[PDB]
């Protein structure tokens, strides 16, 4: 039954054809099951391990790096293998790296908890239905509840289906709908049809939504929808539907990878360009250079280096209490352009606070004076002080304030509890009432010593003094008609009727103040006149529709109550006349106040070019008032077309909506799906958006946003949906979390540039040793070992570079900003040209012009393949020698050690930026050298690798070749800052 909130109770009973008095039939329930299925959100299952590993292989660079590992296996099989059988295992290192880099990724994806299973925790197991099967109530499996069933709910029950209320058997039925509206105050339901067929859950006061739970009362209803078709079912349907996008950086690495897949295909054509005429050996040569061509092109270990860089940011962030569940999100938080954030529980403490209160002062003539007070503290904890005119006063010095707190402590069902496990006070009962309980604690009316109390005894210390002052005989409950409630108290002394027993009354100000024939002035009573009533009804309207928009409760007493045996308590309708001839005492103003640090944190995002949008299910006038307090709006700023309710927003034509999401800062009366749209719209303008929330109703927006941030105090659902938890609930840690993102990516830019322009030299070299007939090509094992650990250690040290000073004064980077720019392309083309020649020039220097180099002949080194009169006097097996290739390896090692010293800063001299500033960089160069020394001096490693040679002079030669790269860059660096300024 769709739109059941708008039809009558008879109409709903008629829609299915049932009476309340007797349920559905076994005939009906069987047919309904076959029509509507069972009552359950369907579980969503993760990917199988087979289908998870396969996803690692979809990337092209690993799809071609896999292809090169296979090609190596064949070459390993052939007699070059069998000449040196032990050292054919270079593919296994390739394969092992592909297996490792894939295994860390699957563990990244395998370790993950399900936010839909977290939602199904709101499905109750059992349900109470009346069916025609039997006369009594029937407790059955809630998944067997079909629509049209008659169901019953009492205190503490989870509502098992979306239910239209038929009969509220208690006085009020109070429901906790935080799962849909994000609010915590109990909603008072009714049975009258709500007509608008496009009313939001906040307006559907006659509905009971599956997942929500009953706070107080008992009710009977008829099921409107079961299973996925329910408001909570729409939440997960939009949660399973959303699909998280590719990181902007991972887009570039896919962009970059997609181009190597093409430029690798092209260099293989230029090798075949050797057709200038002006079989196993020929085959092996085409392949043995193709494999090394791929190994020299794709930056292996860059996935390894990137992973450990984020993993350390995860570790440093946890020091600042930001728990990062997804490692790729530590950089996307830097380019956050917009921050969408929930209100209650996020920007505010979600703890009702009594900010202001007043009582009468003077009443003479048409003049009426009020004592107005201010109460500090933004939490249920009894911490905070009462102020009059911003100077602290002692509440118990005002006789009117004594009565005000007595009414607050006695006309109250709520309590205060200190959770020793959590270390924080928690409400016991209604949020609205618990606020009054905390007020009495802050305003220690009878001056009870509370400094030495344990934290558990402090919770109710002051209320318990008042409880022992007067005995609470009975309580006239809250009822919808009068919007008021009362308690009947007897003095519990020997004075009895002389000191007199009293009625204490609290409720909506209009209803109470009408039934107030007197006005309390301290101890004395004065008749309620026109002027006095207006003066108090004036201030209430000011506190109601002001810059402080506060729910006001009127506190009155009845000094001469009716006779205890004269009042009947079966009937909630006589209660209003019972609460008559009252004496007005005072008024209190309530607010879920913003967290201490939220305001300043917003100003910091504004300073960093990040806007903040509030999106709340709370009433609009309240969200606007919290917005002014936070700084989203000005204190006197006339919000006009800048704050919309979900309905007003939905009423705009689709075109105007996207423009609204760019100019509007506040959104209220919002259903869960409304938040996901606004995120989606902001994303349509291609700015990275961040969603902060804590409730279940935020899980759609938390998933859609590129970066979800859940509060620690929030629901599990919200955490499971998001990529970051604020352990300490400190909103300031978001601003700090961004700073890390901006800083990391800057360092990521360096070690990506550093590791890539290292890869570009390995292709210039491998091409030179292939275009010209040079024997000495770098062996793939060297490129691997260097690109993995010899280049890995330095690149990771670029991750520790100092951050920029203005890092938080620049606007967010464009997500499509390219890493290698225009000149920086040339700068690395020139750097790539050098290191490409420096490794191949060493190769020739051994044979041609060296004392231990027997070859010489240069022109014959270029044509050494055939190997007799042209090769006479020289051994052919001397070209396989390991000594001529150490220079190539040691050139590349020393130049990339030096190129890493150029990577500590783009476009800036190291004469001006000494490597001292990054001490980590220098130590990492040492270990790559110390490990390089190891790969040259221990038989198991110089057998796979090359042998040390010309130690006295070769080392000088490599150091003599590697120096000009610092000058090449330092000249290119000076060319850069001379031209960038103009
Ligand atoms: C030689 C080794 C590599 C890995 C290579 O070819 O990378 C190219 C390449 C794919 C790009 C280029 C490289 O371009 C060249 O190398 C041009 C000359 C090639 C001839 C050499 C043979 C004689 C990078 C290396 O810039 C330079 C320094 O030339 C990175 C850059 O931006 C990045 O991808 C950096 C972020 C990872 C990309 O041009 C990139 O392609 C893109 O899609 C871009 C736009 O992104
Ligand atoms: N934003 C808020 N700030 C402060 N309080 C809020 C706020 N929102 C709701 N409440 C309190 O919560 C109860 C929720 O009832 P509900 O039907 O949702 O009423 P609304 O006034 O909110 O109409 P609305 O949905 O906004 O159009 C109300 O009952 C009472 O105080 C109200 C109430 N009253 O409204 O008059 C009287 C009362 N006693 O005891 O007299 C107890 C309440 N209570 O415990 O929640
Ligand atoms: Cl509203
Ligand atoms: K997300
Ligand atoms: Mg919330
Ligand atoms: Mg309201």
Q: Which of 510, 514, 551, 618 most suits a substitution to test ligand 2, by most atoms within 8 Å of the C-beta? A: 551
Q: How far apart are CA 390 and CA 48, in angstroms?
A: 63
Work out the burial of residue 43: count CB atoms within 10 Å of its CB; fewer than 13 is exposed, 13-18 middle, 19 or more buried: exposed
Q: Is the CB of 551 under 6 A from ligand 2?
A: yes
Nearest CA to ligand 1 atom 5: 760
Give the other-Cβ count within 10 Å of 345's Cβ. 26
CB 170 within 8 A of CB 216: yes
Q: Is the CB of 433 under 6 A from ligand 2?
A: yes
Q: What is the DSSP letter of 619?
A: -
Work out the burial of residue 946: count CB atoms within 10 Å of its CB; fewer than 13 is exposed, 13-18 middle, 19 or more buried: buried
Q: Which residues contact residue 449 at a Cβ distance below 8 angstroms, ignoring those fewer than 6 apart?
A: none
Q: How far apart are CA 201 and CA 209, in angstroms?
A: 9
E strand or H helix at 518, and its extent? strand 518-521
Helices 60-77/280-295 angle, 10° precision = 140
Sign of CA dihedral 63, 70, 298, 940: positive
Cα-based distances in Å from 877 to 83, 343, 865, 957? 12, 77, 11, 24
923 is written with which tokens? Answer: 């130590």
CA 265 – ligand 1 centroid, Å: 14
Q: How far apart are CA 338 and CA 611, in angstroms?
A: 5
Burial 635-653 (b: 16+ CB within 10 A, else e): eeeebeebbbbbbebeeee
Report the Cα 727 to chain-centroid distance in Å: 12
702 is written with which tokens? Answer: 């938390």
Nearest CA to ligand 1 atom 29: 825
39 is written with which tokens? Answer: 């009552």
Q: How far apart are CA 743 and CA 738, in angstroms?
A: 9
- Which residues on adjacent β-strands are paired with residue 558? 503
Cα-based distances in Å from 643 to 633, 670, 715? 10, 12, 27
For this experimental structure, what is the resolution in angstroms? 3.1
Select from 390, 322, 381, 382 the least CA-distant residue to 349: 381
Nearest CA to ligand 2 atom 46: 432
Cα-based distances in Å from 729 to 348, 617, 741, 856? 10, 20, 19, 72
For ligand 1, residues with CB inside 6 Å are 252-253, 255-256, 259-260, 263, 297, 752, 756-757, 759-760, 763-764, 767, 818-820, 825, 828-829
Q: Binding site residues for Mg(2+), as ranges?
A: 342, 344, 694
Nearest CA to ligand 1 atom 34: 256
- Which residues on adjacent β-strands are paired with residue 693? 710
CA 344 – ligand 1 centroid, Å: 49
Work out the burial of residue 323: count CB atoms within 10 Å of its CB; fewer than 13 is exposed, 13-18 middle, 19 or more buried: middle
Ligand 2 atom at minimal distance to the Cα of residue 550: 3
E strand or H helix at 102, and its extent? helix 90-110
In degrees, rounded to 5, the angle at the alpha carbon of residue 908 between the alpha carbons of residues 902 and 910 is 55
Sign of CA dihedral 812, 815, 821, 825: positive
Select from 157, 160, 162 the least CA-distant residue to 174: 157
Cα-based distances in Å from 269 to 293, 294, 356, 767, 894? 12, 14, 81, 12, 31
Q: Is the CB of 183 under 6 A from ligand 2?
A: no
CA 621 – ligand 6 centroid, Å: 9
Ligand 1 atom at minimal distance to the Cα of residue 824: 28
Name residue, tokens 């040259």.
936
Q: Binding site residues for Ca(2+), as ranges?
A: 295-296, 298, 300, 759, 762, 787, 790-791, 896
Q: Is the CB of 432 under 6 A from ligand 2?
A: yes
Nearest CA to ligand 1 atom 1: 760
Burial 206-217 (b: 16+ CB within 10 A, else e): bbbbbbbbbbbb
φ/ψ (deg, to 5) at 901: -70, -20
675 is written with which tokens? Answer: 């938040």
CB 709 within 8 A of CB 723: yes
Select from 60, 46, 56 the least CA-distant residue to 106: 56
212 is written with which tokens? Answer: 């929500």
Helices 951-981/883-903 angle, 10° precision = 30
- Strands ordered across the beta sheet of 174-176: 187-188, 174-176, 213-216
φ/ψ (deg, to 5) at 125: -70, -45
DSSP state letters, 581-600: S-EEEEEEEEE-PBPTTHHH
CB 899 within 8 A of CB 835: yes
CA 140 – ligand 1 centroid, Å: 66
CA 188 – ligand 6 centroid, Å: 11
Work out the burial of residue 655: count CB atoms within 10 Å of its CB; fewer than 13 is exposed, 13-18 middle, 19 or more buried: exposed
Q: How far apart are CA 242 and CA 762, in angstroms?
A: 42
Cα-based distances in Å from 240 to 41, 715, 868? 11, 18, 73
Q: What is the DSSP letter of 877?
A: G
Q: Which of 760, 819, 824, 902 most suits a substitution to test ligand 1, by most atoms within 8 Å of the C-beta? A: 760
93 is written with which tokens? Answer: 């290192």
Residue ranges of alpha helices (H) inside 862-949 are 883-903, 919-934, 940-944
Report helix, strand or coil for 950. coil
Ligand number nearest CA of 703 is 4
Name residue, tokens 């709910």.
153
Report helix, strand or coil for 664. coil
E strand or H helix at 484, and its extent? strand 484-490
Helices 280-295/248-272 angle, 10° precision = 160
- Which residues on adjacent β-strands are paired with residue 488? 474, 503
Q: Is the CB of 785 under 6 A from ligand 2?
A: no
284 is written with which tokens? Answer: 């092996």
Annotated active-site residue in 342, 592, 729, 969: 342
The method of structure determination was: X-ray
Cα-based distances in Å from 88 to 72, 85, 780, 785? 8, 6, 11, 15
CA 340 – ligand 2 centroid, Å: 27
960: left (phi over 0), alpha (psi -120 to 50) or beta: alpha
Cα-based distances in Å from 530 to 367, 519, 801? 10, 11, 73
Report helix, strand or coil for 855. coil
Ligand 2 atom at minimal distance to the Cα of residue 188: 17
Q: Binding site residues, as ranges?
A: 295-296, 298, 300, 342, 344, 433, 480, 506, 551, 616-618, 669, 675, 694, 697, 759, 762, 787, 790-791, 896
Work out the burial of residue 492: count CB atoms within 10 Å of its CB; fewer than 13 is exposed, 13-18 middle, 19 or more buried: middle
711-717 LR contacts (CB < 8 Å, sep 24+):
711/345, 711/346, 713/345, 713/350, 714/345, 714/346, 716/118, 716/121, 717/115, 717/118, 717/119
Which residues are in the CB-under-5-Å shell of ion ligand 5?
182, 342, 344-345, 694-695
Reply yes or no on whether 342 is catalytic. yes
Give the other-Cβ count within 10 Å of 867's Cβ. 13
Q: Which residues contact residue 50 at a Cβ distance below 8 angstroms, ignoring those fewer than 6 apart?
A: none
Q: How far apart are CA 364 and CA 328, in angstroms?
A: 70
Nearest CA to ligand 2 atom 14: 187
Q: What is the CA radius of gyration of the chain?
A: 38
CA 226 – ligand 4 centroid, Å: 28
Report helix, strand or coil for 296. coil
Q: How far apart are CA 195 and CA 394, in angstroms?
A: 51
390: left (phi over 0), alpha (psi -120 to 50) or beta: left
Select from 502, 417, 511, 404 the least CA-distant residue to 459: 417
Measured in Å, how far apart are the chain's first and last C-alpha atoms?
72
556: left (phi over 0), alpha (psi -120 to 50) or beta: beta
Q: How far apart are CA 108 and CA 101, in angstroms?
A: 11
Ligand number nearest CA of 676 is 4
Select from 342, 344, 379 the least CA-distant residue to 734: 342
CB 732 within 8 A of CB 597: yes
Dump strand ranges (E) for 698-825. Answer: 707-711, 724-726
Q: How far apart are CA 138 and CA 151, in angstroms?
A: 9
Report helix, strand or coil for 101. helix
Ligand number nearest CA of 670 is 3
Ligand number nearest CA of 250 is 1
CA 619 – ligand 6 centroid, Å: 6
Which residues are in the CB-under-5-Å shell of ion ligand 6?
619
Q: How far apart are CA 403 and CA 380, in angstroms?
A: 22
CA 676 – ligand 5 centroid, Å: 15
Residues in the chain, overall count: 982
138 is written with which tokens? Answer: 């029937």
877 is written with which tokens? Answer: 């097996």
Select from 352, 455, 354, 448 the least CA-distant residue to 407: 354
5 is written with which tokens? Answer: 């909130």
């Amino acid at each position: 039954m769709e739109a059941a909130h708008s039809k009558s109770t008879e109409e709903c009973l008629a829609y299915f054809g049932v009476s309340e008095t007797t349920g559905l039939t076994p005939d009906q329930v069987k047919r309904h099951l076959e029509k509507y299925g069972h009552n359950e959100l369907p579980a969503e299952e993760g990917k199988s391990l087979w289908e998870l590993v396969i996803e690692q292989f979809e990337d092209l660079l690993v799809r071609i790096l896999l292809l090169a590992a296979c090609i190596s296996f064949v070459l390993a099989w052939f007699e070059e293998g069998e000449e040196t059988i032990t050292a054919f295992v270079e593919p296994f290192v390739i394969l092992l790296i592909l297996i490792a880099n894939a295994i860390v990724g699957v563990w990244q994806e395998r370790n993950a908890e399900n936010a839909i299973e977290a939602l199904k925790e709101y499905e109750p197991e059992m349900g109470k239905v009346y069916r025609a099967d039997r006369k009594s109530v029937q407790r059955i499996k809630a998944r067997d509840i079909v629509p049209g069933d008659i169901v019953e709910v009492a205190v503490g029950d989870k509502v098992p289906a979306d239910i239209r209320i038929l009969s509220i058997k208690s006085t009020t039925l109070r429901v906790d709908q935080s799962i849909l509206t994000g609010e915590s105050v109990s909603v008072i339901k009714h049975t009258e049809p709500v007509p608008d067929p496009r009313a939001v859950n906040q307006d559907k006061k006659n509905m009971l939504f599956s997942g929500t739970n009953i706070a107080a009362g008992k009710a009977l209803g008829i099921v409107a929808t079961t299973g996925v078709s329910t408001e909570i079912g729409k939440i997960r349907d939009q949660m399973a539907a959303t699909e998280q996008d590719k990181t902007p950086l991972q887009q570039k690495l896919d962009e970059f990878g997609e181009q190597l897949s093409k430029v690798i295909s092209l260099i293989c054509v230029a090798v075949w360009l050797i057709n200038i005429g002006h079989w196993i050996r020929g085959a092996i040569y085409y392949f043995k250079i193709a494999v090394a061509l791929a190994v020299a092109a794709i930056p292996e270990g860059l996935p390894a280096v990137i992973t450990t860089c984020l993993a350390l940011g995860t570790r440093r962030m946890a020091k600042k209490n930001a728990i990062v569940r997804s490692l790729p999100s530590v950089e996307t938080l830097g380019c956050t352009s917009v921050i969408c954030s929930d209100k209650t529980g996020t920007l505010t403490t979600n703890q009702m606070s009594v900010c202001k209160m007043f009582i009468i002062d003077k009443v003479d003539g048409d003049f009426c004076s009020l004592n107005e007070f201010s109460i500090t503290g933004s939490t249920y904890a009894p911490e905070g002080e009462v102020l009059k005119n911003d100077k602290p006063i002692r509440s118990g010095q005002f006789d009117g304030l004594v009565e005000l707190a007595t009414i607050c402590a006695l006309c109250n069902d709520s309590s205060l509890d200190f959770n020793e496990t959590k270390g924080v006070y928690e409400k016991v009962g209604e949020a609205t009432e618990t606020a009054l309980t905390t007020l009495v604690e802050k305003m220690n009316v009878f001056n009870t010593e509370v400094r030495n109390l344990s934290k558990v005894e402090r919770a109710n210390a002051c209320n318990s003094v008042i409880r022992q002052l007067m005995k609470k005989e009975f309580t006239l409950e809250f009822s919808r008609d009068r919007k008021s409630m009362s308690v009947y108290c007897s003095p519990a002394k020997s004075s009895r009727a002389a000191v007199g027993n009293k009625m204490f009354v609290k409720g909506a100000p209009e209803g109470v103040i009408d039934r107030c024939n007197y006005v309390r002035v301290g101890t004395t009573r004065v008749p309620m006149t026109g002027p006095v009533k207006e003066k108090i009804l004036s201030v209430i309207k000011e506190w109601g529709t002001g810059r402080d928009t506060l729910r006001c409760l009127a506190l009155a007493t009845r000094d001469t109550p009716p006779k205890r045996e004269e009042m009947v308590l079966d009937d909630s309708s006589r209660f209003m006349e019972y609460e008559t001839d009252l004496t007005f005492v005072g008024v209190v103003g309530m607010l879920d106040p913003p967290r201490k640090e939220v305001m300043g944190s917003i100003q910091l995002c504004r300073d960093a070019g990040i806007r903040v949008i509030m999106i709340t299910g709370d009433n609009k006038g309240t969200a606007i008032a919290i917005c002014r307090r936070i700084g989203i709006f000005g204190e006197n700023e006339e919000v006009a077309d800048r704050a919309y309710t979900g309905r007003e927003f939905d009423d705009l034509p689709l075109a105007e909506q996207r423009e609204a999401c760019r100019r509007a800062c506040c959104f209220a009366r919002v259903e869960p799906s409304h938040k996901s749209k606004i995120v989606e719209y902001l994303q349509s303008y291609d700015e990275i958006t961040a969603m902060t929330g804590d409730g279940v109703n935020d899980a759609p927006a938390l998933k859609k946003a590129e970066i979800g941030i859940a509060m620690g105090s929030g629901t599990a659902v919200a955490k499971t949906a998001s990529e970051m938890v604020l352990a300490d609930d400190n909103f300031s840690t978001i601003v700090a979390a961004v700073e890390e993102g901006r800083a990391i990516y800057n360092n990521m830019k360096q070690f990506i540039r550093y590791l890539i322009s290292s890869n570009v030299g390995e292709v210039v070299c491998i091409f030179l040793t292939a275009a010209l007939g040079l024997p000495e090509a770098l062996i793939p094992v060297q490129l691997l070992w260097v690109n993995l650990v010899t280049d890995g250690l330095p690149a990771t040290a670029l991750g520790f570079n100092p951050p920029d000073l203005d890092i938080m004064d620049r606007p967010p980077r464009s997500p499509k900003e390219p890493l290698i720019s225009g000149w920086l392309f040339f700068r690395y083309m020139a750097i790539g040209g050098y290191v490409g020649a420096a490794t191949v020039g060493a190769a020739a220097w051994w044979f041609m012009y060296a004392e231990d180099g027997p070859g010489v002949t240069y022109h014959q080194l270029t044509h050494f393949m055939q190997c007799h009169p042209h090769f006479e006097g020289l051994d052919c097996e001397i070209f396989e020698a390991p000594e001529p290739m150490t220079m190539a390896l040691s050139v590349l090692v020393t130049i990339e050690m030096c190129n890493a010293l150029n990577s500590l800063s783009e476009n800036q001299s190291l004469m001006r930026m000494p490597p001292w500033v990054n001490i980590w960089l220098l130590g990492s160069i040492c270990l790559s050298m110390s490990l390089h020394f190891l790969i040259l001096y221990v038989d198991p490693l110089p057998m796979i690798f090359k042998l040390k040679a010309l130690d006295l002079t070769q080392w000088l030669m490599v150091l003599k070749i590697s120096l000009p790269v610092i000058g090449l860059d330092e000249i290119l660096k000076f060319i850069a800052r001379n031209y960038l300024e103009g």
